[PDB]
Design an enzyme around this catalytic site. Structure first.
Site, PDB file in Angstrom:
ATOM      1  N   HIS A  10      -3.805  11.669  -6.317  1.00  0.00           N
ATOM      2  CA  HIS A  10      -4.695  12.798  -6.568  1.00  0.00           C
ATOM      3  C   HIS A  10      -5.325  13.304  -5.277  1.00  0.00           C
ATOM      4  O   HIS A  10      -5.426  14.517  -5.061  1.00  0.00           O
ATOM      5  CB  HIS A  10      -5.777  12.401  -7.573  1.00  0.00           C
ATOM      6  CG  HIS A  10      -5.241  12.011  -8.915  1.00  0.00           C
ATOM      7  ND1 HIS A  10      -4.532  10.848  -9.124  1.00  0.00           N
ATOM      8  CD2 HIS A  10      -5.309  12.631 -10.116  1.00  0.00           C
ATOM      9  CE1 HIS A  10      -4.187  10.768 -10.397  1.00  0.00           C
ATOM     10  NE2 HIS A  10      -4.646  11.838 -11.021  1.00  0.00           N
ATOM     11  N   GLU A  13      -2.140  11.207 -27.910  1.00  0.00           N
ATOM     12  CA  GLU A  13      -1.347  12.421 -27.747  1.00  0.00           C
ATOM     13  C   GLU A  13      -1.481  13.331 -28.961  1.00  0.00           C
ATOM     14  O   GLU A  13      -1.573  14.559 -28.821  1.00  0.00           O
ATOM     15  CB  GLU A  13       0.120  12.066 -27.503  1.00  0.00           C
ATOM     16  CG  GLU A  13       0.369  11.263 -26.236  1.00  0.00           C
ATOM     17  CD  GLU A  13      -0.103  11.977 -24.986  1.00  0.00           C
ATOM     18  OE1 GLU A  13       0.062  13.211 -24.907  1.00  0.00           O
ATOM     19  OE2 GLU A  13      -0.640  11.304 -24.082  1.00  0.00           O
TER      20      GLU A  13
END
Lengths: 192, 595
Positions: B487, B357
């Site tokens: 997805h 991150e």
């Protein structure tokens, strides 16, 4: 003995194109240190310590607000929308520029859009010129009939200050201390 | 009377306008995500509708300029970006039908679920229940029941609306001067320039096929070894040279093979490295681990973080009545504002997530100097590749030693190193072929090479012939198994990964070859190496102004993808795999639990 209290603690600041101008006399500036948070001091004809050895006739102390990126443009021979269309100085400018951050006083959570700056202009601005007229600007050949858009845009544009944005978009107040020496009688004294 | 100047002032206004609106929308979204309320979701809905209408209007207004008489590269690129528009050509009726169909998918995919026929009373929702069953189940009948139940409950409802959606989208794509929706999706890679910088549409599929053809044998070898280890795990149950059943891959779809790690450890006496014990013993916290990550980031030659980051980011749960979400994510609000939101645990896994991150946000500030229409990465996979290269760089025994969390008397255990490399390889090499398979299937379906009555047949044939995974029970065309993934159900492209791994390996090799490393490419640490950071700074700060083919060259040395770093990284495992000398090469894939 000047209204440095008033000129440095002004509650509100005008827009860039409607920048204010005042005249001061019969007193001396005695800045100690660090009041320019952004230690900004770029003046040439005088020295920061030698300024107390001089007297001046005319003073043009301006006050306005700019976003973070455009504070660089306050310098002779500089380009950019602010420089060409809002504020211009000649190549022989003589004045010490002061700037500091006031995010704790000039920002609100809901978003502030009370500050404006001109974006469109037909020709390069002359030094020390103000264009407060809100006339429409045109860009095409066919004439618009009072309805905006389609090659005729309103010039002005808002700032949009917020409290959570970074330093690069934080608002800084800017003060320009114009001075000049001529045959006029002395109006500003020193630390005599 | 120059359309160049007309578009110039158009973009000049659009910059400030879009910037202000985007900052407001992002602030509203973050405020909703931190604390959930009905008022917050109302704000979400109203802001989303306002942006949809506003962007549609702005695109329609900007559609009034030509493209064949523009000279400046940057102005031309901005004009192309603003002119590329969708969901505007269709009429009101067709648009409303499409919106209703998509909403029907988004609702019924989450709503549909299956339960146990043997015990009607006992069955829970998909999120905790079936996930727990798949992650803690070791029974053939139970896993088969769960798999078949979900695959028979979802597809029979997802099929018709999906078919109508694909027909409508094909019609719209043909109407919008593109070849088809598959062509539109493939058209996210082309770049136009001179001096041999042209990039057509066939190049992407050409390079992908060329890479897969020469990468398959390593997957074959690791599949053989993993099949043998799974035979050791479960006896008298599967064919010796066959395939891995879909329900024995740890999860429903078998996206990752991470759950098989405890069933393939070569040496039980010497387990994999576990510094979590010393991590807990040292008694550090989220602030401390993030300071260490920031120090590691600074040590390469990248700059310090912002004050507002520490000022406003939330890491420790307040514990009050109001609820939050504990899923770490990377936030880039813009306007020189960056924030994070995560709940921290003391493990290597959370170490890696925090580092990844931080790398994502580092890239975000890296390309943040460009104008608003250019504040974006070169392509989709650049962010994750930049995160993962440094994740691999920071996931090495020499690094975890030189930060002083390991006893000085410990000697470099080649066996533990091989264990860690085996884990990472089993994850990475198993991740990608499924992605390539599914993307190829989706593109074929969109362009129309697969007729209606051949969806599942072609899907299973391609599955077998590419990956080598068999199905335990026959199924008909009513099921819609390939759309089970979120997805696929919610219309997200899956090509951004296989690409991402290739860029990861290329960047890792390029950055580690320059730090004057002595051993093989792996284990390289870039700490206290300024020149690598200096070279990577231009890569990070280029943005999208330059084409990605031009940009990647400045670091790699070539402007085209290559997979040499993958093989040079995985060579030690290939040399190790003397162990499986009794392994036969090839398969027939003709044995299934149907017989």
């Amino acid at each position: 003995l000047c209204p440095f209290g008033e000129v440095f603690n002004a509650t509100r600041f005008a827009s860039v194109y409607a920048w204010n101008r005042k005249r001061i006399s019969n007193c001396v500036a005695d800045y100690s240190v660090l009041n320019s948070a952004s230690s900004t001091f770029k003046c040439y004809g005088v020295s920061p310590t030698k300024l107390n050895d001089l007297c001046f006739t005319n003073v043009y102390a301006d006050s306005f607000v700019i976003r973070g990126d455009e504070v660089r443009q306050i310098a002779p021979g500089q380009t950019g929308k602010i420089a060409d269309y809002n504020y211009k100085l000649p190549d022989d400018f003589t004045g010490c520029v002061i700037a500091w951050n006031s995010n704790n006083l000039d920002s609100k959570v809901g978003g502030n859009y009370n500050y404006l700056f001109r974006l469109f202009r037909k020709s390069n601005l002359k030094p020390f010129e103000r264009d407060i007229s809100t006339e429409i600007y045109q860009a095409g050949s066919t004439p618009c009939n009072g309805v905006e858009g389609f090659n005729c845009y309103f010039p002005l544009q808002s700032y949009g200050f917020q409290p959570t944005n970074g330093v690069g978009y934080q608002p800084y107040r800017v003060v320009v201390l114009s001075f000049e020496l001529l045959h006029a009688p002395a109006t500003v004294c020193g630390p005599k | 009377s120059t359309t160049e100047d007309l578009a110039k002032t158009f973009l000049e206004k659009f910059n400030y306008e879009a910037e202000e609106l985007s900052y407001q929308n992002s602030l509203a979204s973050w405020n909703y995500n931190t604390n959930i309320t009905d008022e917050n979701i109302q704000k979400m809905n109203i802001a989303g509708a306002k942006w949809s209408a506003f962007y549609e209007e702005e695109s329609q207004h900007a559609k009034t300029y030509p493209l064949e008489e523009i000279q400046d590269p940057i102005i031309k690129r901005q004009l192309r970006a603003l002119q590329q528009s969708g969901s505007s050509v269709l009429s009101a009726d067709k648009r409303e039908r499409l919106n209703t169909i998509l909403n029907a998918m988004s609702t019924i995919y989450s709503t549909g679920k299956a339960c146990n026929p043997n015990n009607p009373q006992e069955c829970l929702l998909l999120e905790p229940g079936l996930d727990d069953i798949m992650e803690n189940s070791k029974d053939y009948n139970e896993r088969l029941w769960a798999w078949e139940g979900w695959r028979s409950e979802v597809g029979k409802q997802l099929r018709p609306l999906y078919e109508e959606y694909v027909a409508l989208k094909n019609e719209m794509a043909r109407a919008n001067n593109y070849e088809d929706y598959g062509d539109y999706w493939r058209g996210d890679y082309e770049e136009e320039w001179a001096d041999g910088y042209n990039y057509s549409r066939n190049q992407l599929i050409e390079d992908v096929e060329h890479t897969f053809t020469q990468i398959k044998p390593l997957y074959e070898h690791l599949h053989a070894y993993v099949r043998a280890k799974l035979m050791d795990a479960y006896p008298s149950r599967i064919s010796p040279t066959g395939c891995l059943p879909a329900h024995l891959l740890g999860d429903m779809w078998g996206r990752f093979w991470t759950n098989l790690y405890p069933l393939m450890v070569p040496f039980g006496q010497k387990p994999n490295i576990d510094v979590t014990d010393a991590m807990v013993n040292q008694s550090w916290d989220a602030r401390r681990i993030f300071k260490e990550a920031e120090k590691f980031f600074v040590s390469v030659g990248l700059p310090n973080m912002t004050e507002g980051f520490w000022q406003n980011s939330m890491l420790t749960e307040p514990g009050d009545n109001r609820k939050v979400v504990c899923h770490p994510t990377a936030w880039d609000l813009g306007k020189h504002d960056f924030r994070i939101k995560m709940c921290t645990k003391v493990t290597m896994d959370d170490f890696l997530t925090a580092h990844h991150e931080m790398g994502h946000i580092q890239y975000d500030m890296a390309y943040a100097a460009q104008p608003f229409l250019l504040r974006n990465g070169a392509n989709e996979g650049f962010h994750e590749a930049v995160g993962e290269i440094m994740s691999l760089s920071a996931a090495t025994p020499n690094h975890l030693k030189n930060i002083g969390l390991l006893p000085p008397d410990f000697s470099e255990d080649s066996e533990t190193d091989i264990n860690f490399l085996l884990k990472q390889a089993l994850t990475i090499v198993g991740t990608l072929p499924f992605t390539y398979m599914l993307e190829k299937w989706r593109w074929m379906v969109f362009k129309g090479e697969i007729p209606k009555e051949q969806w599942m047949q072609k899907w299973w044939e391609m599955k077998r012939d590419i990956v080598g995974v068999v199905e335990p029970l026959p199924h008909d065309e009513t099921y819609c198994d390939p759309a089970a993934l979120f997805h696929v159900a919610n219309d997200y492209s899956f090509i951004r990964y296989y690409t991402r791994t290739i860029y990861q390996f290329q960047f890792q090799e390029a950055l580690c070859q320059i730090a004057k490393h002595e051993g093989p490419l792996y284990k390289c640490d870039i700490s206290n190496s300024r020149e690598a950071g200096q070279k990577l700074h231009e890569m990070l700060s280029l943005g999208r102004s330059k084409p990605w083919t031009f940009a990647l060259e400045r670091v790699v040395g070539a402007k085209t993808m290559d997979v040499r770093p993958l093989l040079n990284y995985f060579e030690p495992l290939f040399t190790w795999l003397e162990q499986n000398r009794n392994s036969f090469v090839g398969w027939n894939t003709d044995w299934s639990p149907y017989a």
